[PDB]
Design a protein around this ligand. Structure first.
Ligand SMILES: [K+]
Ligand SMILES: [K+]
Ligand SMILES: [K+]
Ligand SMILES: [Mn+2]
Ligand SMILES: [Mn+2]
Lengths: 198, 199
């Protein structure tokens, strides 16, 4: 009945040298912890305002709900999208879909990189599934706005481009972080999410 | 719970010739009614989502909640802000505050007119009360975003500048609508809302 912080499925240092253990520990144990806690606080406030029919209070809570709820949604997916066992290319129908919809795996990587580099301020780049069209789709989201809740696309792979996702290690050079992160993408998890859509 | 469409404080033609009866009837019986109906549907969907801990669903419902919920909030205030016995100027402490914060009643009208005419697309112009600062403040809101829920200001007087608020009568000439509406402002209601902000 309450949202909880999922354990990281690997050690804080498991993604070194691509994302260092200081980032992983802060990102999970400080940043995500705060979203979950503030999400639960906001949800309780929203339950009270709903039961009273206080629409002003409901609307005033929307920023916190989207930001912290989106934070919890996005980071929960993000941790499973990475793995010490990741890197390389997907296989099977996910790879065939990537080649069909984006031309090639490398072309897909440069489109998702571009979407991720192009976020001005805080946000996320996403590979999603468009269930209406039955094909893959790339989108960028601001701050912690979550993909499915704001666009209807089913999330397959997210890349956090908030500065806390990379700054300690890569400083201002966001492209260096994006170069590195391809080495730890958990294509097994992205594949499972894709198959679940179809 | 279940929100309801409030009765109008007067009949649909009571604000003529400034806002014609066809507009008032559509505005209350069709537009506000739809906000209530869609607000109730959206609240029930949010109750289901909360019980499931479905945060995606909660967030997907926010546009409909803000739009219809804000529509309900704003129009409920709007109807009480107008009156067949309105027009003229406020008195007492509200008039004192208007002179103090905007210089004069006429300069206040200019500023609220300008904010309302300046909305690009659908929206509202508002005179509000800033509780933190203890003075009056003019703001504009897009679409049906409600004043207090999005800015913290307490609404005193709102002017709907959605096209459905004036188009049938004034067509594209929103400034003529703004000039006419001053004739039906219920300063008694605005005063009540102001006094409530500070006792
Ligand atoms: K590196
Ligand atoms: K006339
Ligand atoms: K009058
Ligand atoms: Mn993050
Ligand atoms: Mn309206």
């Amino acid at each position: 009945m309450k949202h909880s912080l999922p354990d990281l499925p690997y050690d804080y240092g498991a993604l070194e040298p691509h994302i260092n253990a200081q980032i992983m520990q802060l990102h999970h144990s400080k940043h995500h912890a705060a979203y979950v806690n503030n999400l639960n606080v906001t949800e309780e406030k929203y339950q009270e305002a709903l039961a009273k029919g206080d629409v002003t209070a409901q609307i005033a809570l929307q920023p916190a709900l989207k930001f912290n709820g989106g934070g919890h949604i996005n980071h929960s997916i993000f941790w499973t999208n990475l793995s010490p066992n990741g890197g390389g290319e997907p296989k099977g129908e996910l790879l065939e879909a990537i080649k069909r919809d984006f031309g090639s795996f490398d072309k897909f990587k440069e489109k998702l990189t571009a979407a991720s580099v192009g976020v001005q301020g805080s946000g996320w780049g996403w590979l999603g599934f468009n269930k209406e069209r039955g094909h893959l789709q790339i989108a960028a989201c601001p701050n912690n706005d979550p993909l499915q809740g704001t666009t209807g696309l089913i999330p397959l792979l997210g890349i956090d481009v908030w500065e806390h996702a990379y700054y300690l290690q890569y400083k201002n050079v966001r492209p260096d972080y994006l170069k590195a992160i391809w080495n730890v993408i958990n294509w097994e998890n992205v594949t499972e999410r894709y198959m679940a859509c179809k």
